Design a protein around this ligand. Structure first.
Ligand SMILES: CN1CC[C@H](C(=O)NC2CCCCC2)C[C@H](Cn2cc3c(=O)n(C)cc(-c4ccn(C)n4)c3n2)C1
Length: 127
C-alpha cells in the first residue's frame, strides 16, 4: 500500500500574509462552528490512507484538504485573503464528493457541514 503524502503546508515564510476582519470571522465563527460539530471528526485531519486502508485515495485526490489544515492556516496567519480559505473549504467538500459514493454516510456528513458552512459564509462581514 502507498505511503501518505506530506500534508498541505500550514505555514510558509515566503508567502505574504495579513489579518483581515473576514479572516478573523472565518477562524472565530466559521471554523469554530464546523470544528465543534458532531460530524467534524472525519474532516479534522488529513486523510490517513494507510490507517484507513484506502490505497487509491491519493491516486484519485491530488489536491487534498481538511479542516485541521485550515484551522492551522488560520491560526498561523498563512492566508492573505478570505477567498483562499473559502477555496480550501470547497476543495475539502469536493474531494469527499468525488472519492465517495452518493449514498455514503461520509457524503451525508459532508453535505450537512457544507450547508452550515454556506450559511455562515453568507454572513461574512464587509472588509
Ligand atoms: C467504501 N467506503 C464507503 C463509505 C465510507 C463512509 O461513509 N464512512 C464513514 C466515515 C465517517 C464516519 C461514518 C462512516 C467511507 C470509506 C472511506 N473514507 C472516505 C473518507 C473521506 O472522504 N474522509 C474525508 C474521511 C474519512 C475518514 C474516516 C475516518 N476518518 C478519520 N476519516 C473517509 N473514509 C469508503
Amino acid at each position: 500500500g502507498s505511503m501518505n503524502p506530506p500534508p498541505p503546508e500550514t505555514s510558509n515564510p515566503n508567502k505574504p500574509k495579513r489579518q483581515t476582519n473576514q479572516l478573523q470571522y472565518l477562524l472565530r465563527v466559521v471554523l469554530k462552528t464546523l470544528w465543534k460539530h458532531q460530524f467534524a471528526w472525519p474532516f479534522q485531519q488529513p486523510v490517513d490512507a494507510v490507517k484507513l486502508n484506502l490505497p487509491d485515495y491519493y491516486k484519485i485526490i491530488k489536491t487534498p484538504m481538511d479542516m485541521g489544515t485550515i484551522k492551522k492556516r488560520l491560526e498561523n496567519n498563512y492566508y492573505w485573503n478570505a477567498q483562499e480559505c473559502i477555496q480550501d473549504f470547497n476543495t475539502m467538500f469536493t474531494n469527499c464528493y468525488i472519492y465517495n459514493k452518493p449514498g455514503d454516510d461520509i457524503v451525508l456528513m459532508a453535505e450537512a457541514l457544507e450547508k452550515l458552512f454556506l450559511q455562515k459564509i453568507n454572513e461574512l462581514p464587509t472588509e
